[PDB]
Design a protein around this ligand. Structure first.
Ligand SMILES: [Mg+2]
Ligand SMILES: [Mg+2]
Ligand SMILES: [Mg+2]
Ligand SMILES: [Mg+2]
Ligand SMILES: [Mg+2]
Ligand SMILES: [Mg+2]
Ligand SMILES: [Mg+2]
Ligand SMILES: [Mg+2]
Ligand SMILES: [Mg+2]
Ligand SMILES: [Mg+2]
Ligand SMILES: [Mg+2]
Ligand SMILES: [Mg+2]
Ligand SMILES: [Mg+2]
Ligand SMILES: [Mg+2]
Ligand SMILES: [Mg+2]
Ligand SMILES: [Mg+2]
Ligand SMILES: [Mg+2]
Ligand SMILES: [Mg+2]
Ligand SMILES: [Mg+2]
Ligand SMILES: [Mg+2]
Ligand SMILES: [Mg+2]
Ligand SMILES: [Mg+2]
Ligand SMILES: [Mg+2]
Ligand SMILES: [Mg+2]
Ligand SMILES: [Mg+2]
Ligand SMILES: [Mg+2]
Ligand SMILES: [Mg+2]
Ligand SMILES: [Mg+2]
Ligand SMILES: [Mg+2]
Ligand SMILES: [Mg+2]
Ligand SMILES: [Mg+2]
Ligand SMILES: [Mg+2]
Ligand SMILES: [Mg+2]
Ligand SMILES: [Mg+2]
Ligand SMILES: [Mg+2]
Ligand SMILES: [Mg+2]
Ligand SMILES: [Mg+2]
Ligand SMILES: [Mg+2]
Ligand SMILES: [Mg+2]
Ligand SMILES: [Mg+2]
Ligand SMILES: [Mg+2]
Ligand SMILES: [Mg+2]
Ligand SMILES: [Mg+2]
Ligand SMILES: [Mg+2]
Ligand SMILES: [Mg+2]
Ligand SMILES: [Mg+2]
Ligand SMILES: [Mg+2]
Ligand SMILES: [Mg+2]
Ligand SMILES: [Mg+2]
Ligand SMILES: [Mg+2]
Ligand SMILES: [Mg+2]
Ligand SMILES: [Mg+2]
Ligand SMILES: [Mg+2]
Ligand SMILES: [Mg+2]
Ligand SMILES: [Mg+2]
Ligand SMILES: [Mg+2]
Ligand SMILES: [Mg+2]
Ligand SMILES: [Mg+2]
Ligand SMILES: [Zn+2]
Ligand SMILES: [Zn+2]
Lengths: 114, 50, 248, 91
RNA sequence: CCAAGCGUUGGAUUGUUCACCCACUAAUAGGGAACGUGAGCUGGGUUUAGACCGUCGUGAGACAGGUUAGUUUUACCCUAC
RNA sequence: UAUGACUCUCUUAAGGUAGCCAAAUGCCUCGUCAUCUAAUUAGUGACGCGCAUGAAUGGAUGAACGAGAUUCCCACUGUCCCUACCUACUAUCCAGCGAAACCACAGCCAAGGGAACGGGCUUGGCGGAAUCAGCGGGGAAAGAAGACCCUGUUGAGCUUGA
RNA sequence: AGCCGACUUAGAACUGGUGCGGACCAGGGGAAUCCGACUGUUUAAUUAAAACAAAGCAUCGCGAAGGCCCGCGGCGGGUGUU
RNA sequence: GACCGAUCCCGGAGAAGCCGGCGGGAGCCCCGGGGAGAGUUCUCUUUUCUUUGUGAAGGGCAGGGCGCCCUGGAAUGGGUUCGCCCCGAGAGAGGGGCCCGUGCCUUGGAAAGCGUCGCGGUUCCGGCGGCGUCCGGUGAGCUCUCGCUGGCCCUUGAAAAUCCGGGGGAGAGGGUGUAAAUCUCGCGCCGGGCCGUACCCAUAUCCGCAGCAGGUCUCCAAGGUGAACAGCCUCUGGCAUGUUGGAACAAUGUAGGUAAGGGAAGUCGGCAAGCCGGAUCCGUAACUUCGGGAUAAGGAUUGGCUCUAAGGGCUG
RNA sequence: GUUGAACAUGGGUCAGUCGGUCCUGAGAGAUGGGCGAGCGCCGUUCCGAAGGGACGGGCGAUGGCCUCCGUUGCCCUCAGC
RNA sequence: UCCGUAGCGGUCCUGACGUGCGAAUCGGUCGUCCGACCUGGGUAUAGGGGCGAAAGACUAAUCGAACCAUCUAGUAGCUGG
């Protein structure tokens, strides 16, 4: 059993000093310093606890590297809001705008007789 | 430590260069009184301040 | 002698408030044309817990009437407020729970919270958890309104200052007994360094005017005059009576 | 089977803090940890998050309520008084 | 009376000296030696600083009034043995 | 026989109520009685006349808990009767290396006198090189210009009706 | 029906000079009294306690030009993002 | 595989506590074989020991997760976990979609590395060669990591640099072509300046006047016994007994033990020492705040060997 | 002691990717202002005319296939922190 | 919450040592060990001031008022020369 040491001067087990084991072409076990796990974007609606789909979960400065199709979904509010709260906002925007027309019609209906 | 700064390393460099014995030919001089180097420093004994 | 513990609190630097994880100053929306002549509508996004405070806070989002921006304010959450609820503000706003309006509009007997003691100072009165104030009477001439503060003392305020309708959420908090010293430690660690209170009779006479003696005793009347110097004004300050409360 | 005869939640406290204090905190520690029905979705998933904060697991609706109960009788009567005063003012 | 040659104990209680009791015995006599004996011991008491009670004092504090916890150093020099 | 509910009198703002006790609090005191022992100034339970108990200067009680204080019993044992034996490292001797404390001069006693307890003085007893391992009687042994007590027209910490 | 594998538990017989948790690891127990509820803390270098703290209980002041406190001084500062 | 668009606005990532349980993937350990080289061989042992692989980055596929979608409408309620939990606000049952893929394969990459055998350079050699680097099985195992779910709080467990997505549509570009504006797509070109980098990191490189039994923050963590990161023995690695050796074995010490008979008579005082101790089976009082007391107290058993019974997956 | 962390001669630390460098935390700390005999102190958004920027246009000049971009000078416009 | 390891601490032997390994250590025995837990680094509070779960504890081996320099060769009816 080969006990192994750190390869950098940081000797404390902090969040950035996280390692994993790796087997080497020289038949020995080394530390490989891992990257932090990324997170998919949370929806802009604010109610859905799940994270968005179709977008890769990377660190924020990795998004400079990635192309646009890896960062969004081909939809209105795509890659920023979930499809459920997109369609539930389409319905809301249509229906309140319709009800405003109903209120405008019922205003003139009262003003016609009075 | 191994995490030195430039000014500390330069100060240590000078104090390393002053820690050599006197050359042999200086006490063949006419107006000479120096027998040896009395300003010498050992790393274990005198801890240089800092 | 030595400077006493109650004297040392005014200098600060140890006894300062622990405000690292607090969410911000909880206050009402600033008064403008909309909230002075009509009403403005906002939405409750979420209800958050403020450390060192039994009351919860509500993050209410309005839209600016002069700029294309969304404005964020931290109200103190009236009990019954949920998210997705529209909170209205101003003179012409209707009378519902979680709906701030000036006290001269609401009728007598209205239960309010986050009351303003002066017009426009964004809420100062009756804003601890479970507390409220009651509107007693108005006075249309000279624009004055009498309110009953949660200490029972009645105050005459201006008729133009604002208060959100309802009681503060998180009531009954002092009903649950703190069972152990650990919960009190965790309570006051979120507020300030004041909790492990040593009695003055357990100290030395250099440390407190009550310390010293071969018996743990005060040795002097603990009732003290109001105009006493600091380092002496301990015990029961300016006390009108000091006994078990019988009657009223 | 039935584990304890008269202590419920407060059996975790053992033989400490006093019987009357445990009997006092038993009501709070039941009502604080009970899951209430939701007034918005109907599911029994309204659980306390902190003091004054009650979150629904299904609807994701959080409500400002009491410290140890979802509703307080000191505020239900206030809700009734405010709706009757609202009807009184507008007549 | 001559007489100090030889003995004069084991324990419960109390830090005790003293005292008191049980038992054995032949007798359970009295004392001194810096009130023998702490570089021989021990530290129960007394006699620092921490605390509690009673009394006294306005108080800090006081009490041959109780209670509890509280560092016991060195000989290899000279003499004596 | 005693104690004595009851009464009278003197009195202060009342005159210690419920409880509790020779208590961590009781001088007398090792209080009296019971129990525990062969024997108990200890322990426990009662009695209360309490020098000087007592109700948030908190009173009484009380499960669990305690490197807290105390008494007794079972079991256990070198704590003891009453000491003995063995092992390791020392101490011992040797090769090498090698200090310090302390030191008026120094060092055998009895008695006398004396600054009222001598190593030296007086009178006696007597005394013999250089040393080794132990030892704790003496050097009124060493350390530290007594912390107790008193004085100083020396102070500091603290308190108050200076 | 065939092929594979992981540690356990219970029972029985035999057997040793009754020895077997064979080294190691590893709670003495009971009846009571006083005090402190407890967990925690404390005089670093003589006192770990019955002392301190503690939750609970109860008083006191204060509605902000305020209560308590700091500061040589300011339209100064802490509690107070109350 | 790209897939115009500014001032402005919205949002996300950075950016989150402690604990419990479960699942997946590595590394290490374990078992059964093939090689290669060693060890024993007085007798036995197809025996014992060592070793037996692949980086970053890219592509593909397992595997894990989804609080993602479509059909359809469920009570004789079902699905389902270790626990939970989910459902007419749509369960089961079919069909898809996304994320992470540190696992496997491939490019790297066998050319290099390692084991073993043998030739050279008389040697100064990243010297040249012959073979091999293989096939499986398992686990409440230990460590790390990923994920799911739950519990606790009068405790709710950081900010900013920096980066991205979206909504809007001011504008820009070309008149049917050697098309234009534009591009987060594949390649191609150039550059990345300054400072630190050795060693000790502790019974000898730091601080205690010193190579001082004191103090001083972390990472890795094998086999057996065993509940165990306990104690004891061993492998890799390390060291020479802690500022000296030899010879003696006196007292008194210091650190360990053992003692007939008695059992606290010792002592201020059971101080010190001693008894008890793990696990299995029964059994367990007064009192109580009903939670405890409680391993109360009390006994019985425990070795070795030979067996039996019971407790599971895979395929048809 | 033929040995050493002793002495005397000589050598030895190589980076776009490992860290510092950048950000903010608790906090420290100028200016405006206030106070102060004074060195100075307070105070960190509070008694402040606190932005030296950008796109589009107009004007002006420069330099190169003076074609078409780039450059700076002025004005209009817009701007939070 | 209990036994108990690492860690943190320091009961008893009033053991060792006590011109010591050590100007506070060592051995056995002990308390606690999921929470009022332990700990590094950064930062804040400075001497009649800080800080104190309160011992007059701690504030660089110094604490019932730290340390350094100066006033200062402070004064002494007292001690020694
Ligand atoms: Mg870092
Ligand atoms: Mg690999
Ligand atoms: Mg995509
Ligand atoms: Mg050194
Ligand atoms: Mg604290
Ligand atoms: Mg005190
Ligand atoms: Mg005073
Ligand atoms: Mg008095
Ligand atoms: Mg004597
Ligand atoms: Mg003597
Ligand atoms: Mg002595
Ligand atoms: Mg004593
Ligand atoms: Mg004392
Ligand atoms: Mg000798
Ligand atoms: Mg009475
Ligand atoms: Mg006795
Ligand atoms: Mg009694
Ligand atoms: Mg009294
Ligand atoms: Mg009293
Ligand atoms: Mg010698
Ligand atoms: Mg003499
Ligand atoms: Mg002579
Ligand atoms: Mg002597
Ligand atoms: Mg002496
Ligand atoms: Mg003197
Ligand atoms: Mg005089
Ligand atoms: Mg004086
Ligand atoms: Mg002074
Ligand atoms: Mg006066
Ligand atoms: Mg009693
Ligand atoms: Mg206690
Ligand atoms: Mg001490
Ligand atoms: Mg101690
Ligand atoms: Mg389904
Ligand atoms: Mg090869
Ligand atoms: Mg668009
Ligand atoms: Mg290095
Ligand atoms: Mg050494
Ligand atoms: Mg040895
Ligand atoms: Mg040796
Ligand atoms: Mg014996
Ligand atoms: Mg025997
Ligand atoms: Mg005895
Ligand atoms: Mg005796
Ligand atoms: Mg003992
Ligand atoms: Mg018991
Ligand atoms: Mg070397
Ligand atoms: Mg390179
Ligand atoms: Mg400043
Ligand atoms: Mg615990
Ligand atoms: Mg424990
Ligand atoms: Mg000792
Ligand atoms: Mg000695
Ligand atoms: Mg030594
Ligand atoms: Mg100050
Ligand atoms: Mg403390
Ligand atoms: Mg004192
Ligand atoms: Mg005089
Ligand atoms: Zn959504
Ligand atoms: Zn709901």
């Amino acid at each position: 059993v080969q006990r192994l040491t750190y390869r950098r001067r940081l000797s404390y087990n902090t969040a950035s000093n996280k390692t994993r084991l790796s087997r080497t072409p020289g038949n020995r076990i080394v530390y490989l310093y891992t990257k932090k796990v990324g997170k998919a974007p949370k929806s802009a609606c604010g109610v859905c606890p799940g994270r968005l789909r179709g977008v890769r979960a990377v660190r924020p400065k990795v998004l400079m590297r990635l192309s646009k199709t890896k960062k969004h979904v081909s939809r209105a509010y795509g890659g920023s809001m979930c499809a459920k709260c997109v369609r539930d906002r389409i319905k809301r925007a249509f229906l309140i705008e319709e009800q405003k027309i109903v209120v405008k019609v019922l205003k003139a209906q009262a003003q016609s007789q009075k | 430590s191994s995490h030195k700064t430039f000014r500390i390393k330069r100060f240590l460099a000078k104090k390393q260069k002053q820690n050599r014995p006197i050359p042999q030919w200086i006490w063949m001089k006419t107006g000479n009184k120096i027998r040896y180097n009395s300003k010498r420093r050992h790393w274990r004994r005198t801890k240089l301040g800092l | 002698g030595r400077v006493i513990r109650g004297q040392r609190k005014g200098a600060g630097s140890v006894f300062r408030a622990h405000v690292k994880h607090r969410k911000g100053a909880a206050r009402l929306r600033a008064v403008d044309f909309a909230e002075r002549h009509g009403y403005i509508k906002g939405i409750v996004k979420d209800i958050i817990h403020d450390p060192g405070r039994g009351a919860p806070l509500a993050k209410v989002v309005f839209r600016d009437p002069y700029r294309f921006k969304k404005r964020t304010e931290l109200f103190i959450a009236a009990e019954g407020i949920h998210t997705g609820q529209f909170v209205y503000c101003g003179k012409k706003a209707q009378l519902n729970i979680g709906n701030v309006l000036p006290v001269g509009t609401m009728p007598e007997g209205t239960i309010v919270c986050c009351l303003e003691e002066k017009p426009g100072d964004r809420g100062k009165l009756a804003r601890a958890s479970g507390n409220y104030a009651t509107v007693i009477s108005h006075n249309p001439e000279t624009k004055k309104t009498r309110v009953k503060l949660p200490s029972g003392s009645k105050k005459v305020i201006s008729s133009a200052n604002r208060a959100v309708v309802g009681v503060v959420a998180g009531g009954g908090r002092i009903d649950k007994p703190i069972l152990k010293a650990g919960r009190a430690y965790h309570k006051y660690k979120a507020k300030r360094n004041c909790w492990p209170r040593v009695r003055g009779v357990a100290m030395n006479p250099v440390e407190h005017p009550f310390g010293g003696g071969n018996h743990q005793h005060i040795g002097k009347p603990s009732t003290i005059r109001r105009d006493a110097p600091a380092g002496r004004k301990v015990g029961l300050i300016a006390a009108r009576r000091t006994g078990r409360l019988r009657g009223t | 089977a039935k584990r304890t005869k008269k202590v419920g939640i407060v059996g975790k406290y053992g033989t400490r803090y006093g019987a009357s204090l445990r009997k006092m905190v038993k009501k709070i520690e039941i009502s604080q940890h009970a899951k209430y029905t939701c007034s918005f979705c109907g599911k029994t998933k309204m659980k306390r998050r902190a003091v004054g904060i009650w979150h629904c697991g299904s609807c994701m609706k959080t409500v400002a309520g009491g410290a140890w109960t979802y509703n307080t009788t000191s505020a239900v009567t206030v809700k009734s008084a405010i709706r009757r005063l609202k009807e009184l003012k507008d007549q």
